[PDB]
Design a protein around this nucleic acid. Structure first.
Lengths: 10, 127, 179, 46, 124, 60, 137
RNA sequence: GCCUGACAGAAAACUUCUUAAAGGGACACAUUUCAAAAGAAAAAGGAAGCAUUCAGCAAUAACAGGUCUGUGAUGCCCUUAGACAUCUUGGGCCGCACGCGCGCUACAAUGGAGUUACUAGAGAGUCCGAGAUUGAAAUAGUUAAGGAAAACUCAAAAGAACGUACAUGACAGGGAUAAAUGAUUGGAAUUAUUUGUUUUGAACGAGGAAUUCCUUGUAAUAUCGAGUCAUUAACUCGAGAUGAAUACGUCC
């Protein structure tokens, strides 16, 4: 879903 | 809405990265950390060009600025002992090298009250 | 909650329906879990706090993280997307039913078995599922967001693998002999 | 014309804070009396 | 690599720290001079000489372990298993002249003159 | 198999220190008064859930 | 018409005037706030009553105190107060009354400052209430 | 004047925010319920409704509580020219087999490390606080307007944003111990005053019995100013930055 600098959730 | 009149209408970090051959590499680009609080040297080999763009932006927003007003800006905390962390000025030679190099490029100047931008310097970044 | 999730959710048991601020009035549907109100100046003022707001503030313990709301909400905001992925339902709904199922119904006092007030049912429910995520994300590769996400979905329906459910039936079983 | 006293452009006052230990020795609980006195400044221009 | 065995799982700048003369900042410099990518994992003959012959490999004298060496020589020459032996001859040198700093080293006390009344509680 | 109850009045606090409430609930299912010992914040209006209404916790 | 929003120490002095729906805080757009987690929070008044009210209004807000979150809570105050004052000085008071009712129904702090302020440290302790540990033995 | 409404240099007025004087403003009055009454509780309004919150002064009487090592305040005793008066040189109150108290820092991924924009409040400055220029790797060394200060100096970090980095690994968490070398302050730094660079890379995996503080901008978290000061804070006195939970109770 979201990819910030803290997590990569896909 | 969104209108553009100056460089305050974009984020600072992306503009600096987008702003990064006159800036010749000195002899201490590798054996020097960006301060005294830090314990590791900068990682990316292009760290000067990120720092060079950032130092130009500081002169843009703050007209009358000096080298020592950049050492405190690029500072950190002293956390090397059991004592509580306190602020400490950043390294000076790395910071003033860009300003002197920027002087020859015609972007910055040497006013009676520190350093300031020039006619072409303001125009160049806006484009 | 973040222009992503709706508030068309209900509560299973009426014992917490009047004590949970979900969509009763217009002040509870808040754009952020960041509200600087005074919810602890009069008794039963905390019920006026949004449910996710109360849950967020419970992730701010153990000293080194005291008084860091921005760091706490980021964990929750990136967890309710994981809960939706693993349940394809409303993350707010998952939290609401998790509270009901993980809520203890009888404790003991120094022993005599006594029931639990509906607010203390809510208060202890939050204190339980956060502790499991806090302990299971310690010295672990897994991030706190998924650690919080998996606990809520596990404690949601019936799973006894969650820390909240184990403790909820731990006190009731002890109170089952303390009648 | 500028006037300053311990008791017009109204310059902000500069309070003079001094704190001391009440005891003349180390014995007893630690109690500090917070001594202070302000300075008021007024400017007259014509 | 310099009579030492290193772990082949970590990155090259952070795997050279196992050498008793090379630490954290020194390791990062020799990786830049040798032209080896820092992000590459540890898992070679160009490194074992810059560690031991750094004066001619674009290094500064203030980045050296042994500055103003005795018994002639001005180079570090400490990035090896030479760390312990070089340290020992300094300690025994003070004892020979019975200097005060050497005397405390002989008794195993706090050399740099600190409050040992309370802290330093190794029961013996 | 859990039967709820509605609080009607509060009879005070007991249990050595103040942490236990003696309230007089009623069961809306059949209007059967029951006296229970409650821990936590309670007002008259709020309701309660009990897994056992067979014990009249009068506490002598 | 000039308004103000207040917080612990942060002050958001605004300048409400006719414009093109443009909002700049200290020269930068409100979409480019430094703590992006509070980007939505400062925009809450805009979606509360709709953006058509702010379509023809210009705002020039300066912040001169507090912290990153104190300023963010003052920005939302000066935005909501500016709409109330503009609808009061020029537009009829009936239209403003319905707008204020919706604002005060959502968040009272939107239109009035928080009276809470930091306390003063006292002798014999690290904070306003906490004291130093006691060693009986 | 410069640039794609921003910026730079002189100007002319205004006081909402800034400052500071005076007055105004809440008295729980106004309603409801409970107690003939003092009064108690809810909600609305209000900037502000627990004495609105935090503070200074704070009675009768007493301790055989601490200070005669603060004084040219002093009684009595004692020493009084080979002195317990005074001054000079050096050593110590910093000494470690151990036990106790107040604290600082860590045991990390709610983290460390690398780059960027940031946001304060309250203090202090006469040879004193020190802007600007430069050489440098940093500590610091050479020349230096302004300021007896709302004028000039005096400046934020916790946090955030940026990366295919670190990935459960006593590891890059931790920085004790030391080995080298460079200066600052001082008549003088050895038993390192302080401190820079490289190397050395230890205990510590959330802590037993006990025990301390805390009810709202409070606890807690990290920081800044001042006291002390030729140089030295991990102490004390203050200030802002973010903002938990649990109670509106009883004598165990």
């Amino acid at each position: 879903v979201k990819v910030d600098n803290h997590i990569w959730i896909y | 809405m969104h209108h553009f009149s100056n460089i305050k209408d974009v984020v600072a970090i992306d503009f600096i990265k987008a702003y990064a051959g006159k800036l010749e590499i000195p002899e201490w680009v590798d054996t020097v950390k960006t301060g005294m609080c830090k314990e590791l040297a900068p990682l990316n080999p292009d760290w000067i060009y990120i720092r060079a763009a950032a130092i130009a932006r500081k002169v843009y927003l703050n007209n009358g600025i000096g080298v020592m007003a950049l050492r405190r800006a690029y500072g950190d905390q002293y956390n090397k002992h059991y004592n509580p962390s306190h602020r400490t000025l950043g390294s000076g030679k790395v910071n003033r090298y860009i300003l002197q190099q920027l002087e020859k490029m015609g972007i910055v100047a040497k006013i009676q009250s520190g350093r300031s931008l020039t006619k072409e310097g303001r125009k160049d970044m806006d484009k | 909650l973040f222009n992503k999730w709706s508030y068309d959710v209900t509560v299973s048991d009426i014992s917490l329906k009047e004590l949970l601020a979900i969509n009763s009035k217009l002040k509870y549907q808040v754009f952020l879990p960041h509200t600087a109100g005074r919810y602890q100046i009069k008794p039963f003022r905390k019920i006026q706090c949004p449910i996710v707001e109360r849950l967020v503030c419970c992730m701010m313990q153990h000293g080194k993280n005291s008084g860091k709301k921005l760091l706490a909400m980021r964990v929750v905001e990136e967890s309710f997307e994981i809960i939706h992925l693993l349940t394809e339902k409303n993350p707010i709904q998952v939290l609401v039913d998790a509270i009901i199922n993980a809520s203890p119904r009888e404790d003991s006092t120094r022993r005599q078995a006594v029931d639990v007030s509906p607010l203390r049912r809510i208060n202890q429910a939050l204190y339980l599922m956060t502790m499991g995520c806090r302990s299971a994300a310690f010295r672990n590769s897994k991030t706190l967001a998924e650690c919080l996400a998996d606990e809520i979905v596990n404690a949601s329906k019936s799973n006894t693998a969650s820390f909240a459910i184990k403790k909820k039936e731990d006190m009731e079983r002890v109170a089952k002999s303390n009648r | 014309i500028t006037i300053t006293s311990t008791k017009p452009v109204r310059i902000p006052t500069k309070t003079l804070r001094i704190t001391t230990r009440k005891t003349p020795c180390g014995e007893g609980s630690k109690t500090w009396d917070h001594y202070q006195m302000r300075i008021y400044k007024r400017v007259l221009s014509m | 690599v310099c009579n030492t065995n290193l772990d082949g799982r970590r990155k090259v700048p952070y795997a050279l720290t196992g050498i008793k003369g090379c630490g954290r900042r020194y390791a990062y410099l020799v990786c830049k001079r040798a032209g080896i990518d820092v992000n590459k994992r540890a898992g070679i003959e160009k490194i074992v000489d810059i560690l031991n012959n750094p004066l001619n490999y674009k290094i500064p004298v203030w980045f050296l372990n042994r500055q103003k060496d005795n018994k002639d020589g001005k180079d570090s020459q400490l990035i090896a298993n030479a760390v312990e032996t070089r340290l020992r001859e300094d300690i025994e040198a003070l004892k020979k002249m019975r200097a005060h700093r050497g005397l405390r080293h002989y008794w195993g006390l706090r050399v740099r003159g600190q409050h040992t009344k309370t802290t330093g509680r190794r029961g013996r | 198999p859990v039967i709820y109850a509605q609080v009607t009045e509060i009879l005070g606090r007991t249990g050595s220190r103040g942490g236990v409430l003696q309230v007089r609930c009623d069961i809306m299912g059949e209007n059967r008064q029951i006296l229970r010992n409650v821990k936590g914040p309670i007002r008259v209006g709020d309701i309660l859930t009990l897994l056992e209404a067979e014990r009249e916790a009068r506490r002598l | 018409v000039q308004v103000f929003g207040k917080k612990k120490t942060a002050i958001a002095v605004c300048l409400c005037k006719e414009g093109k729906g443009m909002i700049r805080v200290n020269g930068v757009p409100l979409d480019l706030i430094n703590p992006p987690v509070l980007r939505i929070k400062v925009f809450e008044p805009l979606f509360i009553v709709g953006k058509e009210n702010y379509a023809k209004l210009d705002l020039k807000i300066r912040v001169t105190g507090g912290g990153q979150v104190a300023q963010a809570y003052a920005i939302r105050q000066a935005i909501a107060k500016a709409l109330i004052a503009y609808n009061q000085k020029f537009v009829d008071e009936t239209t403003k009354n319905e707008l204020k009712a919706k604002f005060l129904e959502y968040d009272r702090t939107l239109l009035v400052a928080d009276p809470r302020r930091c306390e003063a440290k006292k002798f014999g302790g690290p904070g306003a209430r906490a004291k130093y540990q006691k060693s009986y033995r």
